Amino acid sequence: ADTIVAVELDTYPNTDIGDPSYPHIGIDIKSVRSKKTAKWNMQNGKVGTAHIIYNSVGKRLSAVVSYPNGDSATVSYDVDLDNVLPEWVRVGLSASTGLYKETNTILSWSFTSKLKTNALHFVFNQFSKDQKDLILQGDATTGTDGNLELTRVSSNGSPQGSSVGRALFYAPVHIWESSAVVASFDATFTFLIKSSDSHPADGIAFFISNIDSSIPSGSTGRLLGLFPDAN
Amino acid sequence: ADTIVAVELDTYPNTDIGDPSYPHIGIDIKSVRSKKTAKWNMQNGKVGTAHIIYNSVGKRLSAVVSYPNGDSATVSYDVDLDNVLPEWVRVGLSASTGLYKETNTILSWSFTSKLKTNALHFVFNQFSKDQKDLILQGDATTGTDGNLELTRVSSNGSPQGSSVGRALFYAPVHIWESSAVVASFDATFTFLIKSSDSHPADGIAFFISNIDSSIPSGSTGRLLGLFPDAN
Amino acid sequence: ADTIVAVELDTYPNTDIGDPSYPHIGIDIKSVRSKKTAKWNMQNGKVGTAHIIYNSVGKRLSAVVSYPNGDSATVSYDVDLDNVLPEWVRVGLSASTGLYKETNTILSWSFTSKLKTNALHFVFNQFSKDQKDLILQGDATTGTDGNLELTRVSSNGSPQGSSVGRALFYAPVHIWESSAVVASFDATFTFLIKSSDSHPADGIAFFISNIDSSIPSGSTGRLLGLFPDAN
Amino acid sequence: ADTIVAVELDTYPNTDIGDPSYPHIGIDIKSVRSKKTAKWNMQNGKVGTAHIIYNSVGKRLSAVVSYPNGDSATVSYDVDLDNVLPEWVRVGLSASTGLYKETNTILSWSFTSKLKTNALHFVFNQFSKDQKDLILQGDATTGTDGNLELTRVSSNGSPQGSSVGRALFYAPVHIWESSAVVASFDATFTFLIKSSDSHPADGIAFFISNIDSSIPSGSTGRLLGLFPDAN
Numbered sequence: 001a002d003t004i005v006a007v008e009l010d011t012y013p014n015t016d017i018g019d020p021s022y023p024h025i026g027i028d029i030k031s032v033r034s035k036k037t038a039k040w041n042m043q044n045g046k047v048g049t050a051h052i053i054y055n056s057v058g059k060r061l062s063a064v065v066s067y068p069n070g071d072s073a074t075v076s077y078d079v080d081l082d083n084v085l086p087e088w089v090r091v092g093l094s095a096s097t098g099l100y101k102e103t104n105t106i107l108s109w110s111f112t113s114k115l116k117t118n119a120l121h122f123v124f125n126q127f128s129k130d131q132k133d134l135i136l137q138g139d140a141t142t143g144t145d146g147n148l149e150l151t152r153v154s155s156n157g158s159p160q161g162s163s164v165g166r167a168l169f170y171a172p173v174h175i176w177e178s179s180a181v182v183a184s185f186d187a188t189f190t191f192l193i194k195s196s197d198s199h200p201a202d203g204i205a206f207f208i209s210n211i212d213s214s215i216p217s218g219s220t221g222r223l224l225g226l227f228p229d230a231n
Numbered sequence: 232a233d234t235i236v237a238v239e240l241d242t243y244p245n246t247d248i249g250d251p252s253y254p255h256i257g258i259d260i261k262s263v264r265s266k267k268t269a270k271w272n273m274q275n276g277k278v279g280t281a282h283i284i285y286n287s288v289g290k291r292l293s294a295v296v297s298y299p300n301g302d303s304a305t306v307s308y309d310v311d312l313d314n315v316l317p318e319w320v321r322v323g324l325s326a327s328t329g330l331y332k333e334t335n336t337i338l339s340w341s342f343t344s345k346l347k348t349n350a351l352h353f354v355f356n357q358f359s360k361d362q363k364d365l366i367l368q369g370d371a372t373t374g375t376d377g378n379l380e381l382t383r384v385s386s387n388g389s390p391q392g393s394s395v396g397r398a399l400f401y402a403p404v405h406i407w408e409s410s411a412v413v414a415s416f417d418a419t420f421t422f423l424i425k426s427s428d429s430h431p432a433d434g435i436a437f438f439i440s441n442i443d444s445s446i447p448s449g450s451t452g453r454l455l456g457l458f459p460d461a462n
Numbered sequence: 463a464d465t466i467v468a469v470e471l472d473t474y475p476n477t478d479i480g481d482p483s484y485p486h487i488g489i490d491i492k493s494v495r496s497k498k499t500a501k502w503n504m505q506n507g508k509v510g511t512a513h514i515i516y517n518s519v520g521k522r523l524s525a526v527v528s529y530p531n532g533d534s535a536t537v538s539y540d541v542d543l544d545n546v547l548p549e550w551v552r553v554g555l556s557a558s559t560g561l562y563k564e565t566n567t568i569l570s571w572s573f574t575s576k577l578k579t580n581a582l583h584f585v586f587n588q589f590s591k592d593q594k595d596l597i598l599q600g601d602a603t604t605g606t607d608g609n610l611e612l613t614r615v616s617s618n619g620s621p622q623g624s625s626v627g628r629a630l631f632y633a634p635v636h637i638w639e640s641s642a643v644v645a646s647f648d649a650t651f652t653f654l655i656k657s658s659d660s661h662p663a664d665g666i667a668f669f670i671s672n673i674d675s676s677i678p679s680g681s682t683g684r685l686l687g688l689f690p691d692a693n
Numbered sequence: 694a695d696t697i698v699a700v701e702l703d704t705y706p707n708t709d710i711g712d713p714s715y716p717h718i719g720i721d722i723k724s725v726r727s728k729k730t731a732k733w734n735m736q737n738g739k740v741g742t743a744h745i746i747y748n749s750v751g752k753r754l755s756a757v758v759s760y761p762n763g764d765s766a767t768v769s770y771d772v773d774l775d776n777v778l779p780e781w782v783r784v785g786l787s788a789s790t791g792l793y794k795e796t797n798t799i800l801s802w803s804f805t806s807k808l809k810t811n812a813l814h815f816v817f818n819q820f821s822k823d824q825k826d827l828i829l830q831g832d833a834t835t836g837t838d839g840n841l842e843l844t845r846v847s848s849n850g851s852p853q854g855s856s857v858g859r860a861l862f863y864a865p866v867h868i869w870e871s872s873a874v875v876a877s878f879d880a881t882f883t884f885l886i887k888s889s890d891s892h893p894a895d896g897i898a899f900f901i902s903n904i905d906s907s908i909p910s911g912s913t914g915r916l917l918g919l920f921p922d923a924n
């Protein structure tokens with residue numbers, strides 16, 4: 001099984017696998033049942049922002065999700081990523097729909113990792129049809145609206161259930177190094193989740209996995225394309 | 232009085248005004264009584280590096296100091312700096328000698344604040360005999376060996392006593408903004424602290440203060456360049 | 463007199479002091495007589511973007527202006543700026559109205575100089591009603607719509623006549639250093655130039671000047687905010 | 694055949710394939726016979742710096758190679774990389790020895806490419822045994838001196854002839870895009886060429902090639918691992 005560290009933007013409470021009884025942002029350490037979560041009012045059809053921040057000094061993995069009006073959810077978790085993640089990882093995005101669904105749209109994604117100095121930095125404020133520095137997975141596609149649609153969409157712009165999609169930066173990232181004095185990464189991505197369903201599902205995750213990581217089978221819905229299961 | 236947030240590389244144990252009984256790094260908020268410190272073994276005549284990181288999500292200020300051989304010292308303090316720093320600040324470096332002295336040689340200094348974007352970034356890997364972006368104060372001087380001497384050094388390479396100096400970056404810095412999702416800043420500087428005294432003193436600080444902050448009188452020893460008293 | 467290097471977005475053809483007979487971008491060195499210009503079709507009421515790039519290897523200053531639909535104008539001029547700019551400069555934005563007027567709204571501005579490293583970088587995607595890193599001059603004001611109005615605008619959104627204004631970044635900038643392998647800088651700003659006049663005037667400039675440079679009197683029209691005369 | 698844009702740091706005049714009768718830096722466009730060259734005193738066992746700079750506005754591909762003492766060679770060439778290179782490329786380093794030889798050592802390599810914004814940026818100030826974000830080719834190796842040895846070395850630190858080596862960033866780079874207003878890249882790398890031979894050979898190249906590019910067969914010596922032949 002993949003090793004996973006995720007921030008999750010979780011639109012659909014699955015309270016029978018850990019979720020709080022609300023949409024939430026959550027920090028995920030090797031598990032779908034978030035180490036730490038926070039109430040998050042996912043704003044339908046509004047374009048939202050995720051910042052994820054971590055460094056090996058403070059050893060707090062942080063995440064905000066805000067929307068243009070200011071409503072803002074913060075989750076922090078105190079964890080030493082050096083002990084969870086392998087030295088080398090791929091960094092990526094993941095979204096999933098279940099029995100409920102939504103567009104899981106990414107309008108930009110940037111990522112910096114730094115070892116103090118080696119550094120990788122990418123920003124995608126657009127995406128292309130053939131996004132050669134992204135590895136797309138499952139239902140995920142780019143172009144030509146310069147967006148990345150993590151889960152399936154349907155001719156007329158309609159979110160498809162049971163979809164799971166994932167983009168990963170193509171370069172593995174050197175995410176810690178034992179001699180590094182500071183190992184930090186941060187990620188930002190803007191997303192537009194629009195649903196018309198009774199309830200949106202299941203959300204979007206930023207993630208850091210072992211390099212070769214791929215969707216686990218049937219990890220659509222509540223497993224957000226990160227976990228084989230909800231253990 | 233200057234509002235003052237600082238990370239101190241405190242070479243001299245003033246065990247009667249806070250200091251633990253060894254050299255240490257500390258996080259000072261509006262008081263030289265470090266809210267927190269860690270044991271730092273200062274390696275005389277060695278070029279170390281100080282990294283200071285903070286963001287408004289994690290709301291944790293961290294600093295690590297290391298030297299080429301790898302002895303690290305790390306301190307972290309959970310604080311909302313919105314609740315302490317004025318919206319605009321100047322950033323700087325402070326150093327002080329007292330009864331005992333040391334070279335307080337800053338070799339490089341870099342700084343990044345960011346509101347998420349407004350950002351400021353400067354890096355000085357070489358200081359100039361004339362540096363029109365640094366506000367020099369006290370006995371701090373620059374050049375032309377590409378270093379910033381914070382406290383006085385005679386013709387012969389001798390640290391002076393009861394010396395005090397600072398270099399703030401010239402532009403004021405916008406360190407928070409209550410509409411900002413993430414206010415973050417990190418700072419790095421490398422220093423080449425040397426003494427042949429009985430015990431080095433009194434160390435170097437990275438500090439954030441009000442835009443007009445200046446050296447408080449007789450702040451020259453244990454007060455680094457930062458506080459007017461030990462309160 | 464100010465030493466002045468500037469890239470002008472020149473909305474008004476003053477065909478009697480240099481201007482080609484159309485709107486144009488120009489590279490001005492120490493004279494409003496553009497060493498070179500290109501035809502620029504200013505799109506009224508459109509948010510464009512100006513990029514200015516220079517390094518001391520290629521020794522070529524380039525600027526392109528574009529708007530969301532893709533009309534680009536590009537000018538390039540081969541010049542050693544070592545041979546023109548003083549070692550320290552302040553960078554800024556200048557705009558001017560005359561007989562005819564325009565909104566001179568700067569939406570964002572960013573700047574990078576680098577000596578290879580010393581570097582400075584700032585980006586303003588949102589200006590503040592109170593911006594302690596900008597030196598405002600003439601009729602330039604900021605906030606709180608997150609823009610920099612360089613020239614005067616009445617209560618009702620009306621550009622004023624014979625108006626002049628600049629915002630220089632606060633810190634002086636170290637633009638060259640004769641020991642530097644590469645002195646490079648690039649600048650970006652987006653502007654939201656609008657007029658309902660017979661012909662807009664007189665446009666916006668990115669400029670580099672001596673640290674103490676200030677608006678030359680009656681430099682308000684065709685002189686943008688830069689020269690005291692058309693020499 | 695690969696498409697190649699190289700800057701070459703050429704230690705060995707092969708005047709019967711274009712080279713000037715001296716060591717030189719040269720710009721290479723789809724050809725080993727440099728479009729433009731410059732005298733360059735390769736300093737034996739001294740650690741040198743290469744900056745390569747290009748943007749699609751100025752359309753001058755530039756390069757400096759300097760050494761700690763200041764001796765500095767500049768080559769500039771006016772070329773539109775959009776017409777030579779495919780949209781997607783891999784960026785890399787290449788070195789070769791022939792009948793003559795040298796260490797072709799890389800101590801750091803950084804690279805920024807920007808489309809104006811998508812951006813890729815990496816810096817390697819060290820390298821590791823298993824440098825997962827580098828694709829190594831031919832004789833090229835990394836670790837554990839945190840260096841990259843583009844051509845073979847021999848137990849006791851001795852340069853081997855007929856060696857060709859190459860490192861490429863793992864992510865393809867999006868090097869131009871037809872809607873980009875500015876497409877720029879720059880690269881820096883520091884190299885230590887030490888020879889003890891009668892004459893060093895053949896030098897080091899930065900290069901930008903079609904993504905799948907690999908050493909052409911028998912492109913050691915004067916072809917620097919970039920070209921099938923010296924056409």
Ligand SMILES: Oc1ccc(/C=C/c2cc(O)cc(O)c2)cc1
Pocket residue numbers: 117740800801818819838839840
């Ligand atoms: O922040 C940093 C600044 C500089 C460096 C230096 C790397 C380096 C490595 C070498 O083998 C030789 C050398 O001369 C320099 C590393 C990190």
Ligand SMILES: Oc1ccc(/C=C/c2cc(O)cc(O)c2)cc1
Pocket residue numbers: 047107108125126145146147810
């Ligand atoms: O420099 C840049 C700054 C901002 C952007 C914006 C990208 C973007 C793309 C979308 O589909 C929707 C959106 O709301 C924003 C692009 C470049």
Ligand SMILES: [Ca+2]
Pocket residue numbers: 010011012013014019202222
């Ligand atoms: Ca869920």
Ligand SMILES: [Ca+2]
Pocket residue numbers: 241242243244245250433453
């Ligand atoms: Ca003390």
Ligand SMILES: [Ca+2]
Pocket residue numbers: 472473474475476481664684
């Ligand atoms: Ca004019």
Ligand SMILES: [Ca+2]
Pocket residue numbers: 703704705706707712895915
């Ligand atoms: Ca040759």
Ligand SMILES: [Mn+2]
Pocket residue numbers: 008010018019020024026032034
């Ligand atoms: Mn959840």
Ligand SMILES: [Mn+2]
Pocket residue numbers: 239241249250251257263265
């Ligand atoms: Mn102390």
Ligand SMILES: [Mn+2]
Pocket residue numbers: 470472480481482488494496
């Ligand atoms: Mn003009």
Ligand SMILES: [Mn+2]
Pocket residue numbers: 701703711712713717719725727
């Ligand atoms: Mn050659």
